[PDB]
């Protein structure tokens, strides 16, 4: 009876759920893709940092050769190498976490799509049944009259 | 309605340990969440840790691995073991009873305590 | 009673993940603002890197002038360095442009999430189920008339 | 059955963990940036020293206020942005704990099972009729 009509109204509100849960997963994807852009930007900036350190070492070399021809630092090298190791470790960890997030989001989207098609088929079947019932009822009403 | 009372606070040297204790008036076995917050002068009220009615425990990022929340339903107690305390952990610590609406609770339960002070210096 | 009989199909075609989304809207907003702040910090660090590279170039020019005027009473490892610098520079600029585009996209998608969240509310639901009621009534009447004509053709 | 059709949580839980992962990633990236910044500073300092050194050499041969300007401007900008991002990361992490509330076991699970059971009853009634 009207239990099925309120059950048909609620089941049709599955488009209301599909509307908001899909755009959420869209934002989840763009967020992950954005982090991949920032991470690879940190990668290239780290490559750019290594080229600056080498240029400074080359400037230190030729300015010491010029000085010797006319005639603290080790700690600077130590700290440079320490922060370089820190950067490389953080880049490796960020890449691992990025792959984790990518695969997790992939599986989430796959199973969400399968569940959504499942719900769509269920809703279609039930609305078929309900509309056939009400049609049979109206038909028997007209046959009665 | 449950009432919460904090105890076990004080001051401790950086690297020491304390055991805060939230004594609830009523039985908290049916309370959905028991949470420990902290609030420092001039800062926000930070959620430190929380346990659930089924024992699901979780902590804050800066305190994971050195804070331990636990519960004794016989004594109606929620304990918070603080270890290897930093000066950043100095605050008035509160305990809160939370319970979303279910089949037995007509009104949502939201009870605060008066907090115990914890100083690490 | 009846409210649960509606809410059954409602929240089963709805699920608790929608509640998770409507409660994590703010967390996702914070994540998006964090990404924007990190992108701005990356841009500023890129400007700093450009300034450092230019300072290295200037010190190189000065020391080359000094050593030339000294010898007037090392050369191949320079163009390659400049080429690699320019390559990684263009790479970073491209990545930052794409990151800005992606950030704007994410903010727009968040705004659309909130658009739909305001779309349903509590009361557009009732008008929409009213129109669903009208739809079911009309379609049922039509297929009922079809059944009636089938029975009439059987009788004829 | 509907009892075993309550594994939707395993996807919902997934979402939960995913957020945490993303959150952590944010933190990770921030740390990296911070480290780069320090490295940047180091390089900057070195450059100055080199410049200072070359000045000496150049003075040996005898007997700026804008590069430093933009250096300091962008340095203060990066420091303010790192402070803002650290505050935002604290806020995001705390908001995620205030979101790991409810569910992930027997509260939000039985609710899903009962709703699915009601949906099944309605569908059975419709088919029978």
Automatic annotation (TrEMBL), chain C:
<feature type="region of interest" description="Fusion peptide">
    <location>
        <begin position="1"/>
        <end position="15"/>
    </location>
</feature>
<feature type="coiled-coil region">
    <location>
        <begin position="83"/>
        <end position="117"/>
    </location>
</feature>
<feature type="domain" description="Retroviral envelope protein GP41-like">
    <location>
        <begin position="13"/>
        <end position="156"/>
    </location>
</feature>
<feature type="region of interest" description="MPER; binding to GalCer">
    <location>
        <begin position="112"/>
        <end position="133"/>
    </location>
</feature>
<feature type="transmembrane region" description="Helical">
    <location>
        <begin position="128"/>
        <end position="155"/>
    </location>
</feature>
<feature type="region of interest" description="Immunosuppression">
    <location>
        <begin position="57"/>
        <end position="73"/>
    </location>
</feature>
<feature type="transmembrane region" description="Helical">
    <location>
        <begin position="1"/>
        <end position="18"/>
    </location>
</feature>
<protein>
    <recommendedName>
        <fullName>Transmembrane protein gp41</fullName>
    </recommendedName>
</protein>
């Amino acid at each position: 009876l009207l239990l099925g009509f309120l059950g048909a109204a609620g089941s049709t509100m599955g488009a209301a759920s599909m509307t908001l849960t899909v755009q959420a997963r869209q934002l989840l994807s763009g967020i992950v893709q954005q982090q991949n852009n920032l991470l690879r930007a940190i990668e290239a900036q780290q490559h750019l940092l290594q080229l600056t350190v080498w240029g400074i070492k080359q400037l230190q070399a030729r300015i010491l050769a010029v000085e010797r021809y006319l005639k603290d630092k080790m700690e600077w090298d130590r700290e440079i190498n320490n922060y370089t190791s820190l950067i490389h470790s953080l880049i490796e960890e960020s890449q691992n976490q990025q792959e984790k997030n990518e695969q997790e989001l992939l599986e989430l989207d796959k199973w969400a799509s399968l569940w959504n098609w499942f719900n769509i088929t269920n809703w279609l079947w039930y609305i078929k049944l309900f509309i056939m019932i009400v049609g049979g009822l109206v038909g028997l009403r007209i046959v009665f009259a | 309605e449950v009432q919460l009372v904090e105890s076990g606070g004080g001051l401790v040297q950086p690297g020491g340990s304390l055991r805060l204790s939230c004594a609830a008036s009523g039985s908290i076995s049916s309370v959905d969440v028991m949470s420990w917050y902290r609030q420092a002068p001039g800062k926000q009220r930070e959620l430190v840790a929380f346990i659930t009615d089924r024992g699901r425990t979780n902590y804050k990022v800066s305190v994971k691995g050195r804070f331990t929340i636990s519960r004794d339903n016989s004594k109606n107690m929620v304990y918070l073991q603080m270890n290897s305390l930093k000066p950043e952990d100095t605050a008035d610590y509160l305990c809160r009873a939370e319970s979303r609406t279910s089949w037995s609770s007509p009104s949502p339960l939201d009870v605060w305590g008066r907090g115990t002070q914890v100083t690490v210096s």
